[PDB]
Symmetry: D2
Subunit: 454 residues, 4 copies
Amino acid sequence: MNWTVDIPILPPLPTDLRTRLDAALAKPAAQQPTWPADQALAMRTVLESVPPVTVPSEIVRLQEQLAQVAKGEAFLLQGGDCAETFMDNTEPHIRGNVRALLQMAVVLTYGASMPVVKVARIAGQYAKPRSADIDALGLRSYRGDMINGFAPDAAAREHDPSRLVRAYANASAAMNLVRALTSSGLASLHLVHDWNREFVRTSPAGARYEALATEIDRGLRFMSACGVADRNLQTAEIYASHEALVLDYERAMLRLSDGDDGEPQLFDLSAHTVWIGERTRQIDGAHIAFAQVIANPVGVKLGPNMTPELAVEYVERLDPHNKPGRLTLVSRMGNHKVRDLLPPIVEKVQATGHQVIWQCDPMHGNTHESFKTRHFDRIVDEVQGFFEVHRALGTHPGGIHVEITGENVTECLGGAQDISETDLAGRYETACDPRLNTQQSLELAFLVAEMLRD
Amino acid sequence: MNWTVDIPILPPLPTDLRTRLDAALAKPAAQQPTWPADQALAMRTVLESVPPVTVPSEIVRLQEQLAQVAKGEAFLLQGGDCAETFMDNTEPHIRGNVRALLQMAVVLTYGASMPVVKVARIAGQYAKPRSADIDALGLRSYRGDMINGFAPDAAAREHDPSRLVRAYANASAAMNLVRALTSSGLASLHLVHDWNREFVRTSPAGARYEALATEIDRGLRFMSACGVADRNLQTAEIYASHEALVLDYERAMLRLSDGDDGEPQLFDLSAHTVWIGERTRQIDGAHIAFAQVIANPVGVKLGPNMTPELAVEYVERLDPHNKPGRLTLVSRMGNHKVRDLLPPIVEKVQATGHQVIWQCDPMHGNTHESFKTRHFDRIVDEVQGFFEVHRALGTHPGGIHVEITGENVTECLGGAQDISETDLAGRYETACDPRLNTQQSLELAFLVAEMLRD
Amino acid sequence: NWTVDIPIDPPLPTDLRTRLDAALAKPAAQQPTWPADQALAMRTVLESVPPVTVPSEIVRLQEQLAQVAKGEAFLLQGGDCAETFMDNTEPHIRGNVRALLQMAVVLTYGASMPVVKVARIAGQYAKPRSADIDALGLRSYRGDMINGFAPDAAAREHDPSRLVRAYANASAAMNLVRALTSSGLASLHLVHDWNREFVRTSPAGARYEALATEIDRGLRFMSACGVADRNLQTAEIYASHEALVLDYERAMLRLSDGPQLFDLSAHTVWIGERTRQIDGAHIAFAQVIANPVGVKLGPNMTPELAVEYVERLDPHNKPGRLTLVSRMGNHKVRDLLPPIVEKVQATGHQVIWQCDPMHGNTHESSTGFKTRHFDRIVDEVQGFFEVHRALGTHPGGIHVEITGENVTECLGGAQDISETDLAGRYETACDPRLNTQQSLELAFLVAEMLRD
Amino acid sequence: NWTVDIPIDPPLPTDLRTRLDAALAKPAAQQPTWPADQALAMRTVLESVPPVTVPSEIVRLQEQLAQVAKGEAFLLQGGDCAETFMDNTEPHIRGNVRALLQMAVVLTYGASMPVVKVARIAGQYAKPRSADIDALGLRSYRGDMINGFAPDAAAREHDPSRLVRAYANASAAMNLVRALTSSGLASLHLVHDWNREFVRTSPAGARYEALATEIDRGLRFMSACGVADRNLQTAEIYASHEALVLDYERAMLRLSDGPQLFDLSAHTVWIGERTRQIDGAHIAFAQVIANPVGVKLGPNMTPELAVEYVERLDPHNKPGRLTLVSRMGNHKVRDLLPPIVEKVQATGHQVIWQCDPMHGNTHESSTGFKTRHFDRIVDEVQGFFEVHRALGTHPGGIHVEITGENVTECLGGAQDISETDLAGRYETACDPRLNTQQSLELAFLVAEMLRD
Ligand SMILES: N[C@@H](Cc1c[nH]c2ccccc12)C(=O)O
Ligand SMILES: N[C@@H](Cc1c[nH]c2ccccc12)C(=O)O
Ligand SMILES: N[C@@H](Cc1c[nH]c2ccccc12)C(=O)O
Ligand SMILES: N[C@@H](Cc1c[nH]c2ccccc12)C(=O)O
Ligand SMILES: N[C@@H](Cc1ccccc1)C(=O)O
Ligand SMILES: N[C@@H](Cc1ccccc1)C(=O)O
Ligand SMILES: N[C@@H](Cc1ccccc1)C(=O)O
Ligand SMILES: N[C@@H](Cc1ccccc1)C(=O)O
Ligand SMILES: N[C@@H](Cc1ccccc1)C(=O)O
Ligand SMILES: N[C@@H](Cc1ccccc1)C(=O)O
Ligand SMILES: [Cl-]
Ligand SMILES: [Cl-]
Ligand SMILES: [Cl-]
Ligand SMILES: [Cl-]
Ligand SMILES: [Mn+2]
Ligand SMILES: [Mn+2]
Ligand SMILES: [Mn+2]
Ligand SMILES: [Mn+2]
């Protein structure tokens, strides 16, 4: 019960790009799968000839849109599953996650009074880092479906390089549907807002969000009243992102491009934008060096051990040309620490004259065990603290990065539903970290819109 | 000190239109100037060859926009000076009245959540009816600058047919500027709203209107955030209207048109839309019969002696083809009477299956003497009662007709400025009835927007 | 053996499954011979995969095809005769999309009306046969959804896992088509610059200069007039293939959200000359799906059977739902097409009349290669236009086999491809395609038929 | 006497009035001889009337003229030689606007760039003279702003009330121009239908069929491509006249809201051949206003005086602020224009080079009428194009005298107007105009110069 692909038996990379890529990949790389080199090379050779998930002109367009974010003239929303799985890579699940992100985007667009750049964790979020090799059950840790299987048995946890090709197949299939959905009616502003209005009338805390929902509704109707050309309301752009973790995968998805802008560059065409996590951001490591040789916008996760001085080193290495929006610094401090730890980092980075996007990840600093879980109020409070830090400094609170789903899961405590510890057992479906369910993600949008409205 | 025009020494009217026009004009006509027939005919002959103030395709476009109003899908705002004068027919005064109307329109567009058709009392509002021939000073009454002079002496009050040509010259000059202003930046939504925001921060009652002003602001910014094509925000259409009173003038401004829609029709090209007042709406009179033979949208003022049965007769005579928006019925009952008198008229007219625009004139039923004056709260209360009548019947409160100016006059009592009886003497400038000043007109817009929001 | 294996892990409504099951009980010609249990397992995988297309796209195409049927638009359908998995690459997809778009610019200008642009792409992985045993004594190649092109027995086995490989390749191709057409490849100005360069370097460029310059001047006129230009920055390219392998097509059925059955493996599909049996499963399958459909009509067609297709496949008289695709041969089209058109017009229904000038015009070269002469291809389109001109009916579109590659598969054109030139770059896995230059030259020639 | 009399009832800033007063102390040629007290009273009326144009319109025109100066747009200027109060009617205005728009369609297509459309309208009420005493022994007609065309002594008196009559007629005309151009008369599709009908019925229609059909096909291509079409529904027609009567022009000065001085009697004005004295009041007046301005350059022009105009009137090097309007005669343009262009280009400034092919090509017929031959009109434009082609400079526009009336004033064209035909409909109050057919024929001929 296998499908079977052939290992395929152009002009070479420009000499300098080959040199730089090899140098980047020769550096130490944390959190890599352990599979045979010959097998990995077979899979890379397959992936080097597949159609790309994204194309360079979209990445250049995203860079332009992110430059507006960095300049204080747009807001970045990034969200989706903590981990995609091959099993749940289905039309309803994709449709649900795209809907949940669009619903947030409407509320955040209105609240920010500026465009929102909408970036899904989708079409490649198939690899995760682990602090431990051996898990709580004594098994080799699950590292996402690009590496091994979620099932709790030894054979499933074996690192399988064929998962590189399965991950690409699943990613391009998802991406095709995201494109179709967003261009063909799912992203109609009016339809998306109708879902928000239904949330407000059926949610336990709907009375809380009714006033802002109605103001949004009246804002939408005002556009029709004014006779606005409305094609821009019928569709939205949803960009693809994931953590750039498995370097066998990312290097195989590199393509060379440019006869539009000056010189040929390497673009990672597995996504539009990628980020480097806490456990793989070693300053002299392969992940950061790889990010230096690709043209895509990138982000780096910054946790509570971050110094102002290291943050500047990231900026100087990853934004060497001072291109607004090329670099996003993703704060994940914990709600109890963000107000204290973030200001000195922001000050020192702003003093460089570079314009990064400051993005809040309020998930990864606020996890505990009841089930691995997160309380909704701590999530909300970290974004609140993040906004306070920026208001005090006159800097731009540029966006959020959240883990969400359109599914009615029971993974995070709280929200208007008041999800309890005993409730968690009902629909705890994440392959990894607890996600805000569709209602909690929308509620967070409304709360953040009020922080924006200030 | 006279300029001097020549009395000019095509194919004739279609036989049926000539018959119908002659029959209409042979009927009794109230409130007509008393000047020699030979002199009137000389002036009409001059006016029969002048460039028209308006063109038929604009009137057909206005009919279409008014049909939406009648169907409950748009709102009609009509406003301007009670009487234009040749003396104040100046760029600042025109600009100020156009601004005051645009400012109202923004607030009303947002409040109604639907398009507003914007109709100025302008480029022809130069004639008024009088209940008395002899005024309080013993002089022949002033009847507007198309007939005689405002100055309180006998010679000025003589009816002068040369005022027909002066009125046209002044009207076309004003109309030219209204067109220029509205197409070239004065009607930019963003600029107009900036004036409203300034009103809110400097008005004595600005704190009252701050919340709705900010919601409007956020509605405007939302359009930019969504990337709306914005040329429709850079301009607005302001239509010209006046009371069709002086039949020598209106008949001379008739032009024949049509090779677009079936047959040639007579259009009154002195305005886009005209109305018939209380004192000239005799059912078998020349004014109503004249309105039957022109293609323009028309309105009829309905005062407190109106019966349901007469209202239906107006509808059947003036909207014989059941064309939504061809007829506007303009309620002016007084705030103390509107809730009682209007419902039976609305019911009986709705039962016909015709769709008229129901428009509230809250000025002409609410006048008293301290100076002729009106209290702002009675004006507001009549519109309130009008909205209540319609809410109860499920019918469409279709618009308002007000007398306003961009000037900081002191003519109506009250408003956030609390204009007192002693204040009236400061800037009582109207050639006729007391107007809401620029601040009072804007305040009324905000109050009516809340009636719309309900 | 230079392969890698990839492991494989609510139903449609009962009423619609009852319908489908009744339809698919009809005999199906040209089906793969793989085991039913294996086929079922693969269908079960495909029943839950993300679809290649979505229903609102198909509803939109139907609207645009209604306009073609009414004489207010023109249908351009084009791509590889047979897509292969190994050539399903970015350069090849980009080249085929480019080639179709280049034709569409010239045809839009020449027709003076919108062109509905439909690629043979993201699914054209199966073909009937041409014979039980091929010339090498092997089971015939049936396209990559069924078996492998490689001339060995093992490759030629019917492998139902190729259903999943086909879907993976289809969705990956469609993803790229969507990306390219939304991000700059379908910019009218860019596409027309490629056309200008063709006129500049083509051996017959002098012939097409005047019309190229007209188009250029029409394009500049748009800028001159200040039009809002976002609609010049992108184009819609729809996906199509021959609906042949019913295991694949049935597994890709989905219900719309409301609700109808759509085949979401493509936007539109057609039924070929060998599988259009009026009481067969392919026609029955086309009857039950909501997608716009086509039926190939070759020289054995009678007017009466044509009417039977209209009655089966357009029961509700929806203009443009059914396309009748003429493929007669240039020597027969003028004679055979008119009585079919007359009888079908007399039904009251509005079909699209589309010319396939390729499939009735194939012959074998003295040098061995299956080939087609460019002049016969052009002549059938010409005769097709003459038939419709004479009847007052709409010559609604063309259906061609083309590539952006500089292949040597069809004889003639301005390059004067000879029988000896055929050996250079004969790369098709099935029928000979117009190369990029020949396909654009055809577009210019058909543009002059539209202008005439 | 068949007339009716119409009774007549904060200052500009002191600094700007000081400037103006200094400028207007310069001698002014060709001014009316009415009494100063009367002139002052009329100016005082005009100082408070609603303006004919507004500053943001003039700023917008300046932006569009900057593009013409840079070779990225073309200037079309056209209308009556002299407007009269009695012909300032809806049919006549509509016809002249129609005629200009018809030319603009053909020229936009031919230039492959935007056309800035400027009417001689809403102000062209004054002219210099041609002589102290006309051929009837009367004081000369000076245009309707000054006196009456009627050949009697009383009509020929200089009457300053005509300043107010002029303003009333100007504002009424401009009102109508705005209405017509915003409400359907300037619909591209409608205007082009009039052009098609001209090609269909013109004696020389066969000559212009090919280009008319190209335009039609360019228009249909826009619809085919789905462009957002509101910008095809309207056009901007700007107002211009010769700034001659300084009492009128100074009284129509306004300050922008911020602030500059604009002459709000028009969008753009030019200074004629008889009043362009370098140290005169007209040049000084053009120097102080912010409007785009033109200067007529006839055959006595030297390159050096041309440079003096550039330095006086474009002190800030604002491209398109100054237009130099060549009127040499077709027999002299090729010889006289090049050295003027070279010297002016060497200044570094960017003027608009505009061809007036009318005023250097007037002669008298044997039958008495002042006339112009169409072939000489066309030939000067041709030579103008040749001069600029040879220098690598931009042939920036044309300035023509035209009407929508079927008059018989210019000899030739496809209608072959003869000397004997001139007596039929010679209606101009001054110079001979191209009739509606001749003006459109010229547009086709200049479109081919642009295409060549
Ligand atoms: N296209 C605009 C407006 C819009 C359409 N659909 C949306 C859904 C959510 C938010 C905004 C939108 C945008 O993406 O911003
Ligand atoms: N053109 C739109 C929007 C608009 C522009 N300017 C305005 C001023 C007031 C109100 C609305 C507008 C309209 O007239 O409705
Ligand atoms: N979107 C329009 C115009 C267009 C854009 N790109 C194109 C490429 C080819 C043909 C037309 C176009 C259309 O598809 O018709
Ligand atoms: N508004 C555009 C297109 C246009 C509309 N009507 C026209 C009439 C003539 C020429 C062009 C046009 C322009 O002025 O160029
Ligand atoms: N998600 C399923 C089906 C699938 C296969 C290939 C591409 C897309 C989806 C799998 O991994 O087998
Ligand atoms: N994928 C190649 C690099 C490459 C990118 C783009 C084109 C060619 C080569 C590697 O990993 O070494
Ligand atoms: N309002 C002034 C000036 C004026 C004259 C003519 C037209 C417009 C304005 C008047 O009546 O005399
Ligand atoms: N003005 C004419 C009627 C008319 C209208 C239009 C054209 C011709 C005549 C009248 O009063 O009698
Ligand atoms: N086209 C190649 C690689 C590929 C696999 C899956 C999807 C897309 C491409 C093959 O089928 O072997
Ligand atoms: N053109 C006519 C009538 C007219 C007067 C005023 C303004 C417009 C037109 C005249 O001057 O006598
Ligand atoms: Cl059955
Ligand atoms: Cl078979
Ligand atoms: Cl001085
Ligand atoms: Cl002199
Ligand atoms: Mn996570
Ligand atoms: Mn009044
Ligand atoms: Mn084929
Ligand atoms: Mn002249």
